[model samples]
Target: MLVLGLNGNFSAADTDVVPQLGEVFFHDSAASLIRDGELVAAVEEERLNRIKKTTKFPLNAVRECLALAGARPEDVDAVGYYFPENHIDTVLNHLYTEYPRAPLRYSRELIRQRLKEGLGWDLPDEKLVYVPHHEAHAYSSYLHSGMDSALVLVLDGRGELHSGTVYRAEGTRLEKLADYPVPKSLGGLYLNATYLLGYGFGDEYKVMGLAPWGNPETYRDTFAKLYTLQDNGEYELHGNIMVPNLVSPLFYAEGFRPRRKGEPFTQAHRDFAAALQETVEKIVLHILEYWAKTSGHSRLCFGGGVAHNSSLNGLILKSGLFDEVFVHPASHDAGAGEGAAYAAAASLGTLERPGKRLLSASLGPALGGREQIRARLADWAPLIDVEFPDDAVETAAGLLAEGQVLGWAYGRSEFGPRALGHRSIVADARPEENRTRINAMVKKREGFRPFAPVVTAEAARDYFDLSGADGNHEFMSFVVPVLPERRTELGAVTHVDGTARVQVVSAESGERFHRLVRRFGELTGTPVLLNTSFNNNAEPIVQSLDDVVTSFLTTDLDVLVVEDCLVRGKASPDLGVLVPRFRPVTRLVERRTAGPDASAGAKTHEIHLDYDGGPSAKVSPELYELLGAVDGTTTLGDLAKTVGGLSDALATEVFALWEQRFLTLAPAGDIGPL
Candidate 1:
């Protein structure tokens, strides 16, 4: 069975730069699609029509999803919309706070109307299903996890009502198990801790590498009170504290004593950082214990906004809770919409159940050019020297061995949170300057974090020693040993903690990256190159040729390599390309909102769940509560087993919830159904 997943609605953070940030346009509402197990396609609505984060029904994004699947508009049997409410009043509370007249956002009918208006030319005439938010996140990780059965969990600062929830998936069915209180979330705690340490909350990952220097022993006990230890996950709340700053703002918010953003991190922050690491690692291990004891399953499937923490994942992998673990590449909010759509489609039989294909997501964008790729290179010859190769793949590998920093952009884009070479910067792993340049120039990323090494699957163990031969990681979501001996050899790319998120290139990881790594291996004994995203500090890695070129010229990139051509940069950037504005990000947000569905845009939802995918046909208590809501009439009691967030059962229950004759799907952004 072809199963689809979606995460509609995301946790709103400071990163929701609707209009613009720096010189780029950012959309708060773009829907992505994953095909089979690969991230097939992703297009933020605003980027398409020059409207940043357009909130309309995203008919354009939805249509692209179908096209990536090779399905005609009519060929799509059922179209899944993400984020079905587990409880009817889920939105009512929002309404009480934001609007108070009725629902917080739009109704189901409003969504249908918006979609119809947005996709006047192309629309899905088949069944339209609505999925719950948290459940969508679960499906994104669970269904794509090749495990026959596993434990699934979702933890975010907040997924609607609850902060975290657990679930169990067995074959075709899913059931919820338990929930943790809202405001009492590890995700929130981390964010608050980040803010207190003098970093931006949403964008704090830029400095995750800086944490290893601190010593948690200083205040491990003090920060320990933030959360009571949960069974296996992260920190559980001692009481119901929604906001972290309410108790001690200075300890967790931006107004602490010193070491502010732009200022260097001090011992206080460092110690706190170590404490954060301990606390996060502690909770994750604890959560696993719960999964092992409660679910009694050896395999696990993990995802969530928090699943993006590669360090914690690495610790979990090292702890040995299960035989194996898999994490959806887009563990953050990006995969939520895709997860929801998957669940809706699977339950309705619109798509086939996806087997084991989660390593590389077809989740990147492919624009209007197959032949144009060459034409663009030809156009670049006037500005700088471009290299043509008999076989660009092998040529790229040779460049790496010679210590060249070549920007590599080839094949379909990556669907999840990584560049995966589709839009990556390739450099000699041995170059000490590699990390410095990348951190200072293009990425404007921190100094402490290690750049990941992209190596061939066969040479992974011989080089780094991680068993992820295929590069499928759930345990080491982003952290794993860099081989103590190899660290010095690959100085520019190794993290301070001696771990790196290794992207093991399989034979199928794209011919260019694979061939390049192979050639690098042929030239040198080891086969790996320092790899990072292809764009500058704030830009979402390059999505289009123009975006790539603009970034290349503006930044101090040494060599720009795309496909068969290489452009060496020496000239100053054409600042003419970038237009300055008072609020660039705000403008993008306005553009993203200009679409019909600004209020009801197609979105990604998330859930917290823990499940075992065995065919035991045994249902967890929370999942039982979720399944209870699916009888053609939505009710949360049946799906109530999972307490904190939406579960698979709850998602199934919410299928086809959009245009209810009564509840009515929102009619603002019918790019499709929600």
Candidate 2:
């Protein structure tokens, strides 16, 4: 049986059709296709829409999954939705009362209408199945865990009314053991703490990265008051500290000042991060330990947003509480769709061999064939040099061994947030400087953020301590301690605490990448490469030929390898000569407002540019006029001629906007989505 799973609001990308339920309400919108019990395709809507952690409708994602299955929408036997259907009435009532102007198009009827409109499928109401949010999260991890019976734990900010749920799974059955409601959420505590460190939604991982650099004891007492652990694997938050708006005052009462974005990280910030990480680790372990002992399950399957914490996952692995642990690669909401599909299939008795493990996360679209890649390269012939090496993996390995930072886009893109070699930036892990260089030049992210290492699974034991767990960490889900002797050799990937989030690539799952790493090891004694997501902070990981080429050209990466083709940018190429086109999703809005203290009816004109429905900037009238003149076909240098010659200041201003990713610089007449 074919099952289609989905997670997202029905609202369009930039629309507020659902009122209070905007893009940020239910995020990580995605779609997953399951043929029988096997996951055929899964991808987040953010990947195709270019909106990071978007909550827009998963139309693009659903279509992509259907295309991958070579089946039309009508071929799907069942449609599994990630959230429970019972809560829809409550949500609609709240939305209706709070935002009366809302379109009120958030019902099951809307789902059917959208499916029909988006995919031309007249889905029957009986075919639509709703799985509880946490239950879906549990199934997403446990079913693919390859364990006969395991302890399943799902923790997230909020799933319906619950924050966390514990379950015991045997075969296709999931028995709920206990659950923790919202406001007492471990995920909420972590998110609140992340905000105190001046980070916003989705920046929790950055705080996790900064944690190891400082002493946890410095702010341990302060964070300890935030939550209290109870008996029987339970915890409680102090009042409504989990509420985002209320948490700031609580931190202030504790004599803490929230860090501002782009602010320099002081030792205090580091200490706070360390304390937060330590506290989370303690609570997670406390819960897992009690559950493991009580349930007597030697295997553990973890999912939800909290499972994305590799540091905690590593500590759990090393603690020896469970003999085997499986952390879902897409542990966030995106993976919930996969679980929903599994739940629906199991309920229908169509799920065969449910314990079958997910060997690879590369369940998304592939970089097209050689000729297609050549056709893409032909578009940028004037800007880059493309070569087809007899052995692409060998050439890429040689480039990395020579210390060249290479953008690697091999076969299918990964479904999760991780790059996973298919869409990755790799450099020699031996040089610590590569981390700094890649951060500043390629990723344009925080310098303190550490890179991960990809090594052949067979050779993983030589460099990292994976004592209590299986060596298959193809998902980069665990942060393991680097061998004391090998730390120096793998400086770029190792964190300050001597641990590295490592991806142990097996030949079966990642053949091309495994060969490349092995060949690099043959050339250089160490068999590891510093691997990071290919795109910069301004965009999501590159999902298509256009994304790959545009990201490669925009950054300082030395090489781009896609399939058998190797691409290199022209040396000393002037970016000013390139055409400056606004991103496909970018919009410029002009506003007229009354002047503050001027005469009545006097107005001010403001031009603001918005990217991906966020990250907006106000522009001067001259700059706005100049931007308006940008026609994809006109070079920046030529376009500047229309409004006086391109001065250094104007050029710098435009480049700054480009760096922020408000616009793109590409060959003339090259403007389109992948």
Candidate 3:
């Protein structure tokens, strides 16, 4: 049973995408989804086209997933579409704002029409499932929440008509108990704040990062008075502080009411931006306090767009109001698109292990084979010192320690925004000066914007306490404490609170990232590295080999590893013009293992799916019999013996069936959710 989940964050302008706080940073709009918790694939629409924030269906992304999953449209067990909600009457409920015309809701029908016209996909009626945008988000958070019960909060500019709301979850159910409507939305408030301070309206998270520099105490009184916390971990608008106050007309419009975009950053704007973020934090604090007092749940699960603020997440985790905090790596609005897909999968009883998650963020465009990438680098190969290695990581890390920034492209591309080193710009994490240099020279990002450290979860305790870490934090979601003693030693990656968005890499999660970090640990004594998206300045993080090569050339990167080949020195420049070859790390080919039937002879049959769009699934009779029973009541040994003729081929067939989840070899006996 192959399950595919799809999530596309649709937006007209950067602000229109629900739950997205920042203006569109990646050149294109991105869609991502997790298959059985692993980030199967993600792709930004712009790379498929060239328009920034392109409002289109993720056809390329869907096709990529289909190819990687070894399936076609008909093979999909279920399809979940994030339902678009038009909150006409609900605009008033969204906030205490006054509006003459409510934003039109992108109806469910509109979403279906888009998928049909955009992707040219024909689906069976039963396989098609739709989840209201916000509920899809809630399901994404709740179902995998691991909590028998907890407060599930989704805060974005606005989704399904409201900006921010809190849900109480019990088992698989997500019940909405309170809401802080539109105009007074935490997400909208943050964006407005961004505009007031010179930043673009959609760059709220930047403000979240910038807030640490300001003394919220200077405006602490206003922050508290504006967002009043309810008895529950919910907030109600207390004031209209977003306009004509800290956020000036310059942030929005100068007329009676104004909107802002393409704004310039000013000092006053910075202060207001800081203040705006400070206020949102205060509101979250109140919400958590209420939860702590009422539900007595020290653990929290957060979704929606606002959860993307790593700073706020850090703040909440530090408050100790919750024993642990869970933030979906792709908690932003775009995630709900995938969330809806996953929820649909669950609804169909396709099944999922509650806590499985993306091992690495590597689930984007698949790189072409080595020969293909080499073709592009053909001209540069003779001009530069380059070596194609069987093991690029070990070789690249050596270069990184020598103060070289390498374009490390290996394995699957990352999902949900961050680069976890598989397809990343990697540098040594030990040197503090390197951080400042990357800030001032290479990235040209803010100094306060801290880089993260990726380490093995086993070694995680040595550097940071993983107690507050929720599940496998493969995509760099939750923040955990970097033991007070270790912060000074790992200054480059440590946040001001001495906490890090720790990516606890493990072999079971991501093979490539785990191997690289493990090797780095053996060489450097520390497992962490400065991992940043491979792209620079602007451009959706190098979606293709061509993109990576272009980034490698334009920048002074020392080494460019498209797939297996490593390019160094002057060969780096004009990396794109050179026809370099690459090998696509499509999917993890399953490691074949003998099944319980190995000891006995059994007839074996192999099932193969042909790529030529044939509806009939080709399979050996025995393999066909195995998959024919997905109702979960048959024994593996029985299937093997009952095949009537015990043969080596039968054992192999059993092994393959178990490998694919079409058959589960129960260990003795058990009673639990499959």
Candidate 4:
């Protein structure tokens, strides 16, 4: 039997067709297909659409999963959705009747539309099964861990009126032991702190990274007052530490806006982040220990978005509360698809654990074949030196040993947000200068953000403290302390707090990636490489062969490794004229400068074209004037004349806008250099 799982597709509250509903579920959307108790294909919707954390239906992802299984929608035996329609009925105790109800009605219709309109799966009503959100999260962890019995913990912001849950799993059965509800959310507390610290939605990890720079004592008491820890392993909230704080003022203060790049972050911001991370660490450890003691189980399985906190995972593992710990890789809502699929299998009486734990995250789209890679590279053949290397892994690894930066995109893409060897930017981890150079010159992001270390599992214990790390860490989810002796040696990967978000390269992590790191160790005497997601500031992690080549052209890297081939040199060709493929999705914004009146100037508009909605180009008065004359019929000569003999600056500005996707090249074949 085959089970299909899905997450996202928020509601018919008309968010998609009508933008006014302010549709919210925009990230961590995914689809997974499990056949005969084995997971076959899993992928995130963003990979196909080029959006980051898109909430749109996983139509492409689901179809990809079906295709991988060599089947179609009709071949699917059961379907499971990650969230239940009614949170109260599924897990809540009392009816919170005062809560708004209209959206819930719309949510139901939206899922149906996703199935009928999105997937063309016109299934009977009885075929649709809903798994309670937290249950799905727990099942994803417990069932994936290959453990016959374990204590399962689920913690997140809010799921069907429940924020936390505990389950006792034996074989295919899971019994709910505890259900901690809203206002008692550890996730809510952290999210509230995330907002107060000036981070935006889905940027909690930023705060997690910043925490080590601060003194936890600075804001420890401030956070302590916001919540209470109980003897029964439960918690409560105070001080308005709640959700829906999306646009509200923090600490009742005004005049503060979301922090942006280049703005100085004060020490207070760092302290608050540190305090929040430490406080959450304390509470999560309490929860794990409490469950471990109550269940009398030595093995524990953890899920929910909160499990993504590697610091907390580290602390729990070090505490020795459980001998074995398994934190589901897709610990957030995306991983919930696995849970939904597993639970659906259990209900259908076909739930059997896999023979081994999940060892690789390369479950998404497979790598492009040699023919596809050749076709893609053919586009850039005239511009760069390219060849199929005789020894790709050794050649790529040798480049790193020489302290060169390169792009690595091979095999299947990783399912979650991380770049686990596949679709990664890799470099030598030995030099501290490499980190600074990568952050400033290549990534074009904040200098403070540290990179991850992709190490062969054999050498991981020697470089980083991994007492808490188990099989689940293969996905790069856990941040553990870098051993003091090795910290100076691997400065590029170590964080300010002496920790690293390490990816333990497993034998199953594909031959190319695993061997690349393995060979690097053979040459350098250290089996580690600095790895970051393979995308620049303006793009998401690359998904296709086109993205790989385009990203190589667009970014600053010493080498480009596309499967077996290697490429170098810059190409700038002139193929004049351009027109955006689709009409600009425009939105107006008020521009205000400092003044007593503080009145805004004439309102201006920006345009967006990507499915993920961003990287919008703000139209300047001059660019607006230039854009107006391009009717798709106009050539570069006529358009330049419309702008009155385009100077080199004007031409360059037009090219920049085109690069931003504000104006897609119409009719193709204009491919050239920068």
Candidate 5:
């Protein structure tokens, strides 16, 4: 049976979940198609929409998955939605207490509208099934953990009425052991601390990274009030603090101002980060130990947004409570869709009841063949120098060994927030300077952020202490010690705490990247390579050939490798030969004022562009008029004349869009989606 799992609420037509968050309402919508319990295609909406943690319905992702399966929406045997709307108390309670009016107005009708409007799927109502949000998260990790029996723990910001849940899974059955409901959440405490540290939504990872640089003892007293720990394996929020009341201000708003390339984070901020992370790790460790003893299960399958904490993951492995630990790569809400699919399938008895192991994170859209790649590369022929190396892995290894940073694009794009091997910016891990260079050059953000290492699975034991029953070093999900002896040699990937988030590439990774890292180890005697996402700090990972070329020319990256083909970068960008035109399709939102004060009773008009690929950017009013006038009528020069005096400002704007693939590129600027 073909089961489609989906996460997100499409209640708000104009505003999406990315900019707005929850405990009130939330975002980060995604889709995962499961065939006989195996996840075939899965991707977050933000990857295609470019909204960054968008909760908008995964229309683009939905279409892509269906296309991958070569099935019509109507052909889908079942639709598994992540949120359970069938429960009246749950729905009414949230409606009366939390969410805005729009969600309840149309209610479940919105689901049908979203499916029909988004994917042209007009399937019957009986085909849809609802899975409670927390259970979906639990199922997502437990089923894919590759353990026949294990204790599962899921902790996220909020889910339905619960913020965290504990489950006992034996084979295909997952029984709920405990649940810590909202108004009290460990994830909420982390998020609250994230805001206090001047970060925004989805910046928890940043807080985790900054922890080691701080003295946790300095701010431990302040973090202690957020949650109350118990003797049993449970925790709760202190009555003194209310999350939404405090988090709302920091939720959609930017807390800390953006620091310059070399600016340092204040000591106070770092200390708070350290205290928050350490407290979380302590509380989680206590819970895991208590539960492991209570459940009598030595195996643990972990999931939820909090599971993204590599530091805690490491501690969990080192806690010695479980003999085997598994973290589904897409542990966050992105994986919840897959969880929904499995949950629904189990109930229906249609699932193959997948055994303990998941295949790979490359479950999203696969890259096209050489003919398509060459066809796309042909457009930038004049602007680039392309080469077909005899051995792509060997050639890439040599370039990295020589200190050149290369954009690696191959296989399928990863499904979650991380950019495993498929879409990565790779560099030599031996030199400390390499880290600073990539941060200053390609990343163009804070220098404090550390890069991860991708090493061969077998070789991982040599440099890092993989002595903890293999707690998901692959998928870059856990941080491990860079054996004190090997720390100096692999300096680039190590964090301030002397630990590194490591991804051990195994034969089962089944990608050319595994071979690439292995060969690098053979050449340099160090099996690790510094790997970061393959895009500038401003946008999402490169999703297409055009995205790669545009980012290659625009950034300071040294090389671009697509399959066996290589393209060297020039001293400066050369986008002149490529005329730019606004993409024909784009999501457009217009706000109207209620007389004088625009913020008073304002209304919005929204348009879903139906654009199937790349990232979407919000349209600026000034660019709209100019964009509408293009019509692909003439060259960049002539079109500028027709639009009346093309100033340098307009030229730069057009080029910016081209660089982001928001604007179409053609010989004469008359182009559309690629």
Candidate 6:
């Protein structure tokens, strides 16, 4: 049986194509396909649609998974949705009360309607299954752990009416142990404090990164007053502190002002972050310690958004509470799709134990083969020089050894947030300055953010504290302490706290990347490379040849390698000669307004352009007309000829839009796959 699992809202009324605060309940939309208990493909919608944490339906993701499996919608025996249908009415009531504009109710028929409209399949009612949100998260972690029995814990902001759930998995069965109510959520506590620090929904990791720089004692007592621990691994939050309503004054009452976005970090902010991190660690440990003793389970499987905290994961691993820990690579809501599919498979009695442990998260679409890459490279010949290297890995290793930062694209893109070398920016790990340089120039993120080190599995124990840990660190899930002697040696990848979130690469899981690291070690005597996601702050990780080329040109990366093809930017490339093409993800809306001194109803024509469904800006009618003429074949110089030749003002306008990534400038008449 082939089961298809989906995560996200399907109704048009609930979908927020353009991201907005408090507009949608579901996020990290994705689709997964499993055939007879074996995972085939799983993809996040954000990767394909170029939207970050989007709540739009996973139509593109579903199509991609089906295509990868060489199967159609008809071939799928069942479709599993992440959210349970029985709770729709309760969810709708809560949504309407909070967001007055929300739809009165959501209809299950919309799911079938979307399947028919998007995939041309009329899904039968009996073929659809709805798994509880938290259950999906639990199954995703436990089933993938490859352990016969383990304690499974799912933690997140809110799943239906609960915040977290505990379960015991024995063989193919899962028994629910406890459910933490929404008001007592660990995820919400972290999110609320994250907002007070000027970060938003997905910026919790920023707080985790900044925590190492301050003294947790400064705000320990203050944060301690926010929650109370109870007996039997339970806790209670003061007030509605676990709710996501940012207007809650709980954090402000602690005498810390909210940090505005882009403001410089202060000692107070750092201390507060540190205190918050420590408090979360204490609470989680309290719960896990009690449960581990009660259940007597030696192995653990953890999931949900909170599981992304590598620091906490490391603490758990070292606490001696569990003999082994397995964190689902896509532990966030995205993984819920895979979990739902597994649930459906189990219900149909088709789920089977895997032949071996899941080693890599490279389950998505692969970068095309050699000829396909060359063809795409040809499209940007005017902007870059491309060479087919005899050995791309060796060339990349040599470049890194020479202190050149490069973008590496190989095999399938990773399923979750971490790059994991497939879509990564790699540099030498020796110099600390490389971290600051890449943070400022290439990543365009905060300098406080540290890069992860990708090291060969055999060498991981030598550089990082992996004592008592089982299996490889293939998912980069845990932040282990860097060996004291090696901390200064691996400066670029080591965090301020003397720890690193490490990715341990093995030949079987990451053959090319593993070889690259080992070859670099042979040259420099250090088996590690500083790895980060390939794209910059404004975009998701590069998913195609176009994404690679565009990101390479716009960023300060020294070199780019897609398989055996090496790309280098040309010197003094002419923008005027290149063609300007509007990105497919951009949406342009034309509007007219009455002129300032209009007695005769004179109007102004303006085009409001939405870039990648996020930022929006208005442009003049003439400029809009120029952009409208872009067809990927007409050069900017030729198009300007119709408008009395390109003037400095026109050129500045076009360049400005390109800088914001509203459009792409490529060689004239160089259209490739879209």
Model 3 score (lDDT): 0.59
lDDT of 5 by residue, 503-526 (tens): 888888745888888898888898
lDDT of 2 at 73: 83
Q: TM-score order of candidates, best first?
A: 2, 6, 4, 5, 1, 3
Clashes of 2: 0
**Global lDDT scores for all candidate models:** 0.58, 0.82, 0.59, 0.74, 0.74, 0.81
lDDT of 2: 0.82
lDDT of 6 by residue, 1-674 (tens): 88998898653323442234342367788998887677789889878776677676788889889988889889999888888886754665565677776556454676777788988999988888888888889988887788999999999888877999999998878899998998888888888888888888788988999998888999888777778889999988776445545324656665678898779999988998899899999989989999999999999898999999988998998898988999988999989888898887777665664555678888888777677678868877768898877888888899989999999998788998998878999999999999999999889888888889999988888899997656338899999999999999999999988999999998987999999999999999999999998987767788877778778888889999987899999895556777777655555666555656864443344433332236666666667777777777888988887777777888778766665566666665432332
Please state every model's RMSD to the true fold in angstroms. Answer: 16.6, 3.0, 19.5, 5.0, 5.4, 3.3
lDDT of 3 by residue, 626-654 (tens): 44432334344444445664356655554
**Candidate 2 local lDDT, 1-674, one digit each (tens):** 99988887776544544533543567898999988688889999888877788777888899989888898887999988888886855676676778767665655877888788888989998888998999889988987888889999998888988999999998778899989888778778787778888787888899999999989998788777767899988887776535555356666877889988779898989998998899989999999999999999988998999999999999999997998999878999999888889888877775654446787899887777767668767867767888888888888888888789999987778988888879998999998899889888788888899999999877899999999866249899999999999988998999999999999988887888889889999999888999899887777888888778878877888999977789998774455667887665566666655566863553333332332246766665556677889888888888877778677777767766665567777655533322
Q: Estimate, for each residue in 5-37, the C-alpha lDDT of model 4 and write its tens digit.
A: 888764221134224222244247789988888
Q: Which has the higher lDDT value, candidate number 4 or candidate number 5? A: 5
Off by over 4 Å in 4: 10-23, 87-108, 241-261, 382-385, 468-471, 573-580, 583-605, 609-615, 620-651, 658-674
TM-score of 3: 0.71
Candidate 2: where are CA atoms >4 Å away? Answer: 18-23, 240-247, 353-355, 572-585, 590-613, 618-623, 626-659, 663-674
Q: Provide backbone clash counts, one per model.
A: 126, 0, 48, 7, 7, 0
TM-score of candidate 6 relative to the true fold = 0.92
For this target, which candidate reaches the highest lDDT against the unseen true structure? 2
Alpha carbon lDDT at 130, candidate 4: 82
TM-score of each: 0.75, 0.92, 0.71, 0.87, 0.87, 0.92
- Candidate 1 regions off by >4 Å? 1-28, 32-40, 43-60, 70-75, 85-110, 121-126, 230-235, 238-258, 367-370, 378-384, 467-476, 570-674
